[PDB]
Write a structure and sequence with these properties.
- The structure is cut from a larger assembly and holds chains A (about 220 residues), B (about 40 residues), C (about 750 residues), D (about 100 residues) and E (about 210 residues).
- Chain A is mainly alpha-helical and about 220 residues long.
- Chain A has one domain: Chlorophyll a/b binding protein domain (Chlorophyll a-b binding protein), CATH 1.10.3460.10.
- In chain A, about 40% of the residues lie in helices and about 0% in strands.
- Chain B is mainly alpha-helical and about 40 residues long.
- Chain B is built from 2 helices and no strands.
- Chain C has one domain.
- Chain C is globular, with a radius of gyration of 29 Å.
- Chain C starts with 6 loop residues before the first strand and ends with a helix.
- Chain D has about 100 residues and is α+β, with helices and mostly antiparallel strands.
- Chain D is built from 2 helices and 6 strands, in the order ββαββββα.
- Chain D has a 4-stranded mixed beta sheet with strand order 2-1-6-4, covered by helices on one side. In chain D, strands 3-5 form a two-stranded antiparallel sheet.
- Chain D is globular, with a radius of gyration of 12 Å.
- The chains are: A mainly alpha (about 220), B mainly alpha (about 40), C mainly alpha (about 750), D alpha+beta (about 100), E mainly alpha (about 210).
- The interface between A and C is medium-sized, with 16 and 24 residues.
- Bound molecules: chlorophyll B, chlorophyll A (7 copies), ligand XAT, the ligand CC1=C[C@H](O)CC(C)(C)[C@H]1/C=C/C(C)=C/C=C/C(C)=C/C=C/C=C(C)/C=C/C=C(C)/C=C/C1=C(C)C[C@H](O)CC1(C)C, iron/sulfur cluster, FE2/S2 (inorganic) cluster (FES) and 1 more.
- The PDB classes it as photosynthesis.
- The entry lists the keywords photosystem I, light harvesting, photosynthesis.
- The entry is titled "Plant PSI-ferredoxin supercomplex".
- Chain A: Chlorophyll a-b binding protein 3, chloroplastic.
Chain lengths: ~220, ~40, ~750, ~100, ~210
């Protein structure tokens, strides 16, 4: 168990039962002494898991279009950056089949249907596989652990029916999630500072290293 | 809810409501019959 | 040892049952009323947290959530200000022509003829002229449309709801424990470097990107609607580089350390902007940058969790010498266990700060077009002086509360406190003496002057023409401040203010913004009057604090509490020995001192500063300049200041200033009404209530909660409250009517 | 309602029945087990006593320490017996200290 | 009076409030403000919800049928909103006075029965006539139940009543939507529906 900037305070409660437990907690946020709302350590682990999952999704998605803008018949009008698709209308917008406000309302409706139920699984573990849902309830029973619900839905292929299985896979999952979280933060501050897009930025750096980092501190805009 | 009904009948709240209603009533009367010095009816 | 978050879950449950049972907090009130006295006590002890219970944890939880409630209220008041500027105001027209439109953000409904209060404030609008100076702030902010005012009103409403929710949350769901509160090192590190450092850094940022360019465009003459929006200045940068070439290099200097290349918009000019009569914005941005750097560094002094830093206990224990014994050993234990000690220190400092704000904002006007708006300047100086005085008096109140309820040499012993307690007699003796001597040599000069002026002997007066008393040191210091830029401050161009001198005068719209203020015999007399009043107030408050526990007259005074009427008529009579009564007496003297301060400033500014200037350049002051020769007698204050300037308010009936004429008289009434409570006692009143109760009993209409006369202490408190309200409101109406009428 | 009361006393320990709306003293007055009182108004320490079990309503009690009602002592003449209680009598001085 | 313990719940996973047991029809356990935690409060508000639902259903019919067949050239009834003014054989104040007398009689009768059940049942002029329904808010008798359709024994009456209360909730909401659409827009509701149907992805409220 390699340690990064550990301490005799962090190393007390960070025993090792968690994946990627590196004893790194220089601020002491997991300390179970005075725990209240949204500072409880289980919720912090669940939150890291969800942030990392969404980060893997979003970090692969925010770069995919402008990569396929260069290879194939993919039409360039549908090859935008991640900041000039409608995310920041003062930086570029599009005309989809809906308004971008009706889009917001409808996407919020669908995600409300999803996330209220995921929470209600967190709060009273095993609630959702009891009330009628047009079917769709026999698969939303749960597994006692919020972040790893299992079922016929969230595990079709049946990966990891033992303990070494699950521990090794969980480690790889949280590590990739951390990497993608870092990557998304880099996306944000790169796409502000140089203001061109991460793929274009990488391709403008792979040629020459003359303008790697400190060059862009002139911050054109 | 019953506790709220009781609380709403405590002295300061009851007087506040009573006088706000009275004020609305006199204000509207004077907005309809302005500048009255006498009883001009009978 | 280490620093961490520590919280309890669900300490108290949200319920209505305690609303319906009045006085749940105190066991005595909970029992219910027999007499009307109950109803008064219920309100007097409502926020006396450390008296409802003994547990320090509970008191601190209550204090934290009460602070959240106060912040929610302040946000709601800000929301109202911005909404009224957006909806019922003439701000846009004033933005078009600031030196002709007088600001107004309140209109009234036409109900009983009161629409006469909607006066002609210019710009096609009729309402009430405001004096809070909000238009000046909104112009210095860059705000140019009412949509931005709407937006800020909505944001403030959101923030108020957020504060209220956090207040509920930290008391009922996640309540921090005592060890969290008692960590002062991390708290100071955050407030120094996080609240004040990051705050002024962020604000310097906003001034560099919004206020500076929009004000450059506005002062260039551009129509306030054809100016670009602020965010354009951020998207397109050539707009910025047109006004400030330095924005082309764009943070390369800040790293290449050639900060010289920013001299474009970070200057050190000093003096006023001769176009708007305010400080250079390029000076204010640079100022805020420097202040942010200073605070961000200062927020790294105290040790929290990584060894490096300073232990407050170590600093205090290190300081001691042969005159003070062991001093400062034992103050960390005290300043972390009593809320009243903290409150006293904090109130003292905040009151002094408010007074300093008053002086600095008149003398170096920060906002554009504020210096020539005379009503706003008078209002701001006066308001802030009153606030400062009140807070300083509260400081004494809570020092006395600490001395009665918390000081304890058996478990928390400090040496310096003990030694001051052991020579309080000499302390109070010398302060008493110096106040008597100071009162003879300042007011006595006025009495000498009045008597020499009435006896036809003006050559025997104390004045600039007969017997001069020139404040040599004040003249010497402002002469040093005049020669400063270039000699002891080579980096400055003009000096800090125009009151120092140098022969520089700033005008705006044919009005006088600033010019050198002359010091003479009258200035000498007024300042010694001020020293006298402050010394007397100090004597009363410090006597109240030092003798809060015991005296040669009553040797166990701490056992009677902090607020008690007396200890009976024996020993000669012992009315008003408590420390509460000393606070009660000090309020009158604070009123006296602040009133004289605001009268001195109001007469002096009109007489030698404010006025109108002609194209040929001949300044005509509002009053003729009669402060130098009429301020030195009392008759000149009664005649040339009160009688001559009350004309505006006693002639406002029929105009839009008639509300001030009504409030003048109402305030006189409330003041005279308080004397009844101040001059009498409750025995007479209870005996009169006896007969009135008989009359009610005769008709089976007598109440079951037996009516009593007020308490002795309540009588005193009602008296001082109405006295202060009456007096301050009288001066409020007088000032506002007078200043609004002439200009 | 009318819970049974128990009073240790130098005379012994005796029980009497008596409704909760009453003060203990007049109820020991009913059956006739003599107790020491001076004031009958809750403003002295002659009717003082402490408790063995349960606890007694001390709403209309005054002239007591902000503790005398949290560590055992009670004045019998201003006290409502909310429960089947077991109390002490002649307890002024070990209260007087 | 059949305390269905595991009924459908508006918020799955909740635990319903203690006063909402399962007896009342159309029960789903929704009272997050706790406005029905006292039995007398609950029965009064049951009457209020019921009568509101029946009024709303009458109103929803009277708008949405005449409008849907006014767009189509069936009838020529003016806008339900603007139909307040288009004047009839008299004016409106007298029309209101006669409506007032007439309906206020009936509402006073319903009042009496709400505060004292079954104490106004029969007719004074003709005592033989008698309302046949034995519950408050479900009058029955020949006038309000000549078809006998209503009076039966539970599992039959309970379902019919739940169906009533759900139709009524939807009708309250429906007329509320008619109001707010025609105040936001200056249109008719069927026009709103047709426009939104011809361009759903764009003809929403977010058109201003
Ligand atoms: C439940 C009964 C009822 C309802 C919902 C309405 C509703 C309406 N009527 Mg009607 N009326 C009703 C009964 C009657 N009206 C009239 C006589 C008139 C006239 C003469 C007029 C209306 C008009 C109106 C409209 C008023 C516009 C407005 O904003 O008003 C105020 C809205 C509120 C106070 C909001 C109430 C909702 C609540 C949830 C809050 C409105 C939609 C007016 C119209 O057509 O305007 C263009 C009009 O001129 N009504 C009579 C007498 C026969 C009625 C008898 O019951
Ligand atoms: C939750 C993560 C996430 C989110 C919020 C988005 C959001 C978006 N994506 Mg994206 N994408 C993602 C993940 C994500 N994507 C992933 C994981 C991939 C594969 C690695 C892609 C590959 C991708 C491509 C190739 C394109 C988008 C495009 C878009 C934009 C319009 C998509 C659309 O029309 O809806 C869906 C409509 C349907 C009918 C289905 C939109 C802002 C499109 C775009 O705007 O071009 C710039 C575009 O062409 N996405
Ligand atoms: C004892 C003192 C006193 C008296 C006798 C009056 C008397 C009067 N005032 Mg006045 N007022 C007073 C004090 C007094 N005021 C004070 C102290 C102030 C300062 C706050 C004012 C400020 C004031 C204003 C601004 C106005 C008045 C007005 C009036 C007149 C109103 C007539 C009216 O309301 O129509 C009739 C009202 C009724 C018939 C109400 C009775 C109906 C009941 C509710 C229904 C019962 C049915 C059975 C009236 C002659 C108004 C006026 O017109 O002046 C000429 C008006 O404009 N007063
Ligand atoms: C916390 C305050 C604050 C904030 C939030 C910003 C934010 C910003 N500044 Mg900045 N700036 C600040 C204070 C601040 N400044 C101060 C105090 C100075 C004086 C030293 C400067 C001097 C400055 C320059 C010279 C430039 C910026 C620029 C920028 C923008 C570049 C975008 C970026 O890379 O980030 C950005 C929005 C750049 C810009 O204008 O982009 C439009 C630019 O070149 N700033
Ligand atoms: C940060 C500021 C602050 C804070 C938090 C406190 C907090 C506290 N003070 Mg304190 N105090 C302060 C400033 C402060 N004070 C100042 C500036 C002064 C100088 C005046 C005092 C002087 C003072 C005294 C003399 C006393 C306290 C006391 C107390 C304690 C109980 C207060 C209470 O609930 O009474 C109840 C509050 C009220 C009954 C409201 C009074 C309403 C006023 C009189 C009316 C004001 C008029 C209004 C402004 C305008 C008129 C409106 C009208 C026309 C409609 C409490 C812990 C009391 C104590 O015993 O300490 C343990 C005590 O007696 N304070
Ligand atoms: C004792 C009165 C006095 C006062 C109040 C000041 C005040 C000031 N001087 Mg100054 N100075 C003085 C005497 C004084 N000086 C004298 C007698 C001389 C010799 C003639 C100088 C020569 C001098 C020079 C050459 C400069 C200043 C500068 C400054 C300004 C920046 C202060 C600073 O550098 O931070 C403090 C720096 C520190 C390292 C903190 C030290 C704490 C002190 C020394 C205690 C400041 C307003 C600078 C300026 O022009 O600003 C634009 C500057 O260039 N002064
Ligand atoms: C005037 C209308 C009205 C009234 C009186 C009631 C009354 C009742 N409902 Mg009901 N409800 C209504 C409308 C109403 N509802 C509508 C329109 C819906 C569909 C959204 C529902 C859906 C619903 C469910 C799912 C359930 C109830 C239930 C209940 C019962 C629980 C007790 C209670 O809520 O306390 C008393 C009720 C009130 C005091 C009325 C509250 C009126 C508030 C102040 C309105 C506030 C304004 C509103 C929020 C915004 C209006 C604008 C909007 C229309 C755009 C009760 C008898 C529970 C039940 O078991 O039924 C038997 C239950 O589970 N209701
Ligand atoms: C509480 C429900 C309610 C209310 C208040 C109204 C009110 C009104 N209806 Mg209406 N109506 C209703 C229900 C209601 N209706 C229902 C359920 C239907 C069937 C869907 C209709 C179908 C209808 C038609 C076809 C017409 C009206 C018309 C009218 C208007 C005047 C004539 C009239 O009332 O008929 C008279 C009733 C008598 C007993 C006589 C009037 C504003 C008429 C109108 O608008 O005038 C041009 C008209 O054309 N209504
Ligand atoms: C929406 C509504 C009520 C909604 C109430 C809600 C959501 C309350 C919910 C909750 O409180 C609960 C229950 C429980 C709490 O713990 C939680 C909350 C959330 C607080 C009532 C509408 C009720 C609406 C009604 C009753 C409508 C009747 C309409 C009629 C009669 C029409 C008459 C007309 O005749 C005119 C006048 C003119 C003619 O030309 C044409 C027409 C238009 C036909
Ligand atoms: C550990 C610790 C402890 C100690 O004691 C202290 C400290 C140090 C503080 C710490 C920490 C650290 C860190 C680093 C943190 C971070 C994190 C992150 C980064 C996250 C993210 C996270 C992230 C995330 C979620 C993200 C997500 C995203 C997404 C979905 C995206 C989306 C999108 C796309 C696709 C595209 C489009 O067009 C747009 C959008 C729509 C936008
Ligand atoms: S009762 Fe009043 S007059 Fe008498 S000693 Fe006390 S304060 Fe003085
Ligand atoms: S007699 Fe002293 S308390 Fe009852
Ligand atoms: Ca913790």
């Amino acid at each position: 168990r390699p340690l990064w900037f550990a301490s005799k305070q962090s190393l007390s409660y960070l025993d090792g039962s968690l994946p990627g437990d590196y004893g790194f907690d220089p601020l002491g946020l997991s300390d179970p002494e005075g725990t209240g709302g949204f500072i409880e350590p289980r919720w912090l682990a669940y939150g890291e898991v969800i942030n990392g999952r969404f980060a893997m999704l979003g970090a692969v998605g925010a770069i995919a279009p402008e990569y396929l803008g260069k290879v194939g018949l993919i039409p360039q009008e549908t090859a935008l950056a991640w900041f000039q698709t409608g995310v920041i209308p003062p930086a570029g917008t599009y005309n989809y089949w809906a308004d971008n406000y009706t889009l917001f309302v409808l996407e919020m409706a669908l995600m409300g249907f999803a996330e209220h139920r995921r929470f209600q699984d967190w709060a009273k573990p095993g609630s959702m596989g009891k009330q009628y849902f047009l079917g769709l309830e026999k698969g939303f029973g749960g597994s006692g652990n919020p972040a790893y619900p299992g079922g016929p839905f969230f595990n079709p292929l049946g990966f990891g029916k033992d303990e070494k299985s699950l521990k090794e896979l969980k480690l790889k999952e949280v590590k990739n999630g951390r990497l993608a979280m870092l990557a998304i933060l880099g996306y944000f501050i790169q796409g502000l500072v140089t203001g061109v897009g991460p793929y274009q930025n990488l391709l403008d750096h792979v040629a020459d290293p003359v303008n790697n980092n400190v060059l862009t501190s002139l911050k054109f805009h | 809810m019953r506790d709220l009904k009781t609380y709403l009948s405590v002295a300061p709240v009851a007087s506040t409501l009573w006088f706000a209603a009275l004020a609305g009533l006199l204000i509207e009367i004077n907005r309809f019959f302005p500048d009255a010095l006498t009883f001009p009816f009978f | 040892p280490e620093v961490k978050i520590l919280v309890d879950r669900d300490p108290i449950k949200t319920s209505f049952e305690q609303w319906a049972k009045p006085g749940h907090f105190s066991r005595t009130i909970a029992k219910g009323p027999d007499t009307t006295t109950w109803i008064w006590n219920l309100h007097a002890d409502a926020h006396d947290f450390d008296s409802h219970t003994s547990d320090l944890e509970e008191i601190s939880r209550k204090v934290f959530s009460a602070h959240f409630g106060q912040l929610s209220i302040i946000f709601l008041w800000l929301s109202g200000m911005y909404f009224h500027g957006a909806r019922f105001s003439n701000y846009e027209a004033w933005l078009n022509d600031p030196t002709h439109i007088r600001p107004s953000a309140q209109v009234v409904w036409p109900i009983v003829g009161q629409e006469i209060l909607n006066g002609d404030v210019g710009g096609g609008f009729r309402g009430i002229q405001i004096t809070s100076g909000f238009f000046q702030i909104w112009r210095a902010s860059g705000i140019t449309s009412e949509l931005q005012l709407y937006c800020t009103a909505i944001g403030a409403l959101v923030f108020a709801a957020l504060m209220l929710f956090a207040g509920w949350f930290h008391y009922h769901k996640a309540a921090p424990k005592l060890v969290w509160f008692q960590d002062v090192e991390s708290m100071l590190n955050h407030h120094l470097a996080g609240l004040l450092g990051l705050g002024s850094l962020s604000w310097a940022g906003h001034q560099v990107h919004v206020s500076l360019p929009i004000n450059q465009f506005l002062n260039a003459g551009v129509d306030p609607k054809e100016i670009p929006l602020p965010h354009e200045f951020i998207l397109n940068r050539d707009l910025l580089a047109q006004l400030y070439p330095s924005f082309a290099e764009g943070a390369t200097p800040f790293f290449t350390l050639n900060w010289s290349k920013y001299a474009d918009f970070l200057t050190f000019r000093g003096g006023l902007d001769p176009l708007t009569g305010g400080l250079w914005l390029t000076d204010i941005a640079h100022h805020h940058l420097a202040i942010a750097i200073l605070f961000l560094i200062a927020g790294h002094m105290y040790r929290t969790n990584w060894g490096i830093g300073h232990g407050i206990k170590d600093i205090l224990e290190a300081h001691k010498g042969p005159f003070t014994g062991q001093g400062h050993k034992g103050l960390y234990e005290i300043l972390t266990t009593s809320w009243h000690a903290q409150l006293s220190i904090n109130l003292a400092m905040l009151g002094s700060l408010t007074i300093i704000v008053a002086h600095h904002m008149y003398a170096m006007p920060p906002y554009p077009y504020l210096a020539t708006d005379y009503g706003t300047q008078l209002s701001l100086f006066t308001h802030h002086m009153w606030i400062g005085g009140f807070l300083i008096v509260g400081a004494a109140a809570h020092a006395a509360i600490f001395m009665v309820r918390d000081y304890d040499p058996t478990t928390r012993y400090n040496d310096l406190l003990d030694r001051v307690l052991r020579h309080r007699d000499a302390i109070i003796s010398h302060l008493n003496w110096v106040c008597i001597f100071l009162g003879f040599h300042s007011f006595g000069l006025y009495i000498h002057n009045d008597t020499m002026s009435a006896l036809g002997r003006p050559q025997d007066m104390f004045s600039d023409t007969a017997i001069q008393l020139q404040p040599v040191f004040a003249q010497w210091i402002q002469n040093t401040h005049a020669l400063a830029p270039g000699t002891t401050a080579p980096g400055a161009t003009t000096s800090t203010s125009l009151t120092w001198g140098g022969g520089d005068l700033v005008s705006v719209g044919g009005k006088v913004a600033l010019l050198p203020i002359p010091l003479g015999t009258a200035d000498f007399l007024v300042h010694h009057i001020h020293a006298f009043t402050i010394h007397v107030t100090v004597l009363i408050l410090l006597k109240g604090v030092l003798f809060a526990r015991s005296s040669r007259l009553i040797p166990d005074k701490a056992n009677l509490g902090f607020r008690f009427p007396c200890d009976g008529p024996g020993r000669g009579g012992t009315c008003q020995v408590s420390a509460w009564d000393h606070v009660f007496l000090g309020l009158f003297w604070m009123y006296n001192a602040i009133s004289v301060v605001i009268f001195h400033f109001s007469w002096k500014m009109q007489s030698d500063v404010w006025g109108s200037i002609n194209d040929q350049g001949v300044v005509t002051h509002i009053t003729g300049g009669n402060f130098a020769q009429s301020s030195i007698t009392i008759n000149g204050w009664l005649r040339d200041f009160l009688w001559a300037q009350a004309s505006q308010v006693i002639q406002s009936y029929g105009s839009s200033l008639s509300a001030y004429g009504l409030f003048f008289l109402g305030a006189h009434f409330v003041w005279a009404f308080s004397l009844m409570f101040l001059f009498s006692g409750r025995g007479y009143w209870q005996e009169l209530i006896e007969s009135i109760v008989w009359a009610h009993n005769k008709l089976k209409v007598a109440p079951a909660t037996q009516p009593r006369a007020l308490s002795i202490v309540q009588g005193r408190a009602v008296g001082v409250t109405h006295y202060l309200l009456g007096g301050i409101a009288t001066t409020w109406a007088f000032f506002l009517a007078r200043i609004i009428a002439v200009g | 309602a009318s819970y049974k009361v128990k009073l240790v006393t130098p005379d012994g320990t005796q029980e009497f029945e008596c409704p909760s709306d009453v003060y203990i003293l007049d109820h020991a007055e009913e059956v006739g087990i003599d107790l020491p009182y001076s004031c009958r108004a809750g403003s002295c320490s002659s009717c003082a006593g402490k408790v063995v079990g349960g606890e007694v309503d001390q709403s209309d009690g005054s002239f007591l320490d902000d503790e005398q009602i949290e560590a055992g002592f009670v004045l019998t003449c201003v006290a409502y017996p909310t429960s089947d209680v077991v109390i002490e009598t002649h307890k002024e001085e070990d209260l007087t200290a | 009076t059949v305390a269905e313990p595991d009924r459908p719940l508006w918020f799955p996973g909740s635990t319903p409030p203690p006063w909402l047991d399962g007896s009342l029809p159309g029960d789903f356990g929704f009272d997050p403000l706790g406005l029905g935690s006292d039995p007398e409060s609950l029965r009064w508000n049951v009457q209020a919800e019921l009568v509101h639902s029946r009024w709303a259903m009458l109103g929803a019919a009277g708008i949405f049928i005449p409008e849907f067949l006014t767009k189509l050239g069936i009838l020529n009834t003016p806008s339900w909103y603007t139909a307040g003014e288009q004047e009839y054989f008299t004016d409106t104040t007298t029309l209101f006075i006669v409506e007032l007398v007439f309906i206020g009689w009936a509402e006073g009768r319903r009042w009496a029965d709400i505060l004292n059940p079954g104490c106004v049942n029969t007719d004074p002029i003709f005592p033989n006539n008698k309302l046949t329904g034995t519950d408050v808010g479900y009058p029955g008798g020949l006038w309000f139940d000549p078809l006998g359709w209503g009076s039966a024994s539970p599992q039959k009456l309970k379902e019919l009543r739940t169906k009533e209360i759900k139709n009524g909730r939807l009708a309250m909401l429906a007329v509320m939507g008619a109001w707010f659409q025609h105040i936001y827009t200056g249109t008719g509701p069927i026009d709103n529906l047709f426009a939104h149907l011809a361009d759903p992805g764009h003809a929403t409220i977010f058109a201003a």
